[PDB]
Swiss-Prot record:
GO terms for molecular function: aspartic-type endopeptidase activity. It is found in: Secreted. The lineage of its organism: Eukaryota, Metazoa, Chordata, Craniata, Vertebrata. GO terms for biological process: digestion; proteolysis. It comes from Homo sapiens (Human). The chain holds residues 63 to 388 of 388 of the full protein. This is Pepsin A-4.
Length: 326
């Protein structure tokens, strides 16, 4: 339909190029199902990270409209501060007219200095948008620019090309079998219930349900530190000298699958997925991290999981669709 190709950066970041302004100034942004704002750096920004990324210049856009509204976004690791503007955004072949977006003035610290993308384009619900800014996909829907109120994500493996976000449609050739549907529990993130996590038929974690977010913007499978510790020992991972969670590469042949049961359907994740090969080394794809929400402790099904399952994000019916990648 309307395809946006993404680049696979070392199986860790997925980003694509969008246009802003008339004529379009180009940025690479993370397609982030774990946040809702669009922002890019601007000529108003002198922070470290602003020295080596593309900077939007409002003056070169004949369609740019300013506001007197400000935005702050705090992230996993980075943060920005800036102002809100309107312009036309080219995303996935679509002219998304009248799009509110963040222009940064400050991008503190240094995490964003090393990142390979300029900014971020969130695909979650408007309720977690900073300064209630209309998210991109919401704007495209309200202007009737897609025929279906959903989008799809195929994430490729092993540095390959082919990763894609499909706005307003599903393409069958990216998956095997048929879609199963999981209702979204709390509308903000793409939040779903996991019924349990098992290995060899035993519940190693989340034995009686837990909450997870389907997040294209996080690289690894993430959970609360304690149950992650149990999982790390079950796969024979170990802290080494410099903190990293290493596993012997022999293991990939003999470890059982780790199965996420979601809405009564089992989704196996094989060791070739949840163990990452840095060629010389094999590290665990599971990471400990306590995220306190009202929901309590959140799991994050990140790129490790999404690579195994073509994911449909259905805003009409508030549900997530999953099926094995082809």
């Amino acid at each position: 339909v309307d395809e946006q190709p993404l680049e696979n950066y070392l199986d860790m970041e997925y980003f694509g190029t969008i246009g802003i302004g008339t004529p379009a100034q180009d940025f690479t942004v993370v397609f982030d199902t774990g946040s809702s704002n669009l922002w890019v750096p601007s000529v108003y920004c002198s922070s470290l990270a602003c020295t080596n990324h593309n900077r939007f210049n409002p003056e070169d856009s004949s369609t740019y409209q300013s506001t007197s509204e400000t935005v702050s976004i705090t992230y996993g690791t980075g943060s920005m501060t800036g102002i809100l503007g309107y312009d036309t955004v080219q995303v996935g072949g679509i002219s998304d007219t009248n799009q509110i977006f963040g222009l940064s003035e400050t991008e503190p610290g240094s995490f964003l200095y090393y990142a390979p993308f300029d900014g971020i384009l969130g695909l979650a619900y408007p309720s977690i948008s900073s300064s209630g800014a209309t998210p991109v996909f919401d704007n495209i829907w309200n202007q009737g620019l897609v025929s279906q109120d959903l989008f799809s994500v195929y994430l490729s493996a092993d540095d390959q090309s082919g990763s894609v976000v499909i706005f307003g449609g599903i393409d069958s050739s990216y998956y095997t079998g048929s879609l199963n549907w999981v209702p979204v529990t709390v509308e903000g993130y793409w939040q779903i219930t996991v019924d349990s996590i098992t290995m060899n038929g035993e519940a190693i974690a989340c034995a009686e349900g837990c909450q997870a977010i389907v997040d294209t913007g996080t690289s690894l499978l993430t959970g609360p530190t304690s149950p992650i510790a149990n999982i790390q020992s079950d796969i024979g991972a170990s802290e080494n000298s410099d903190g990293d969670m290493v596993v012997s590469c022999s293991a990939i042949s003999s470890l059982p699958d780790i199965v996420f049961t979601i809405n009564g359907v089992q989704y196996p994740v094989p060791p070739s997925a949840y163990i990452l090969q840095s060629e010389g080394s094999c590290i665990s794809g599971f990471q400990g991290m306590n995220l306190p929400t009202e929901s309590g402790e959140l799991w994050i099904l990140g790129d490790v999981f999404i690579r195994q399952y073509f994911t449909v994000f259905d805003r009409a019916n508030n549900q997530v669709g999953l099926a094995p990648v082809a």
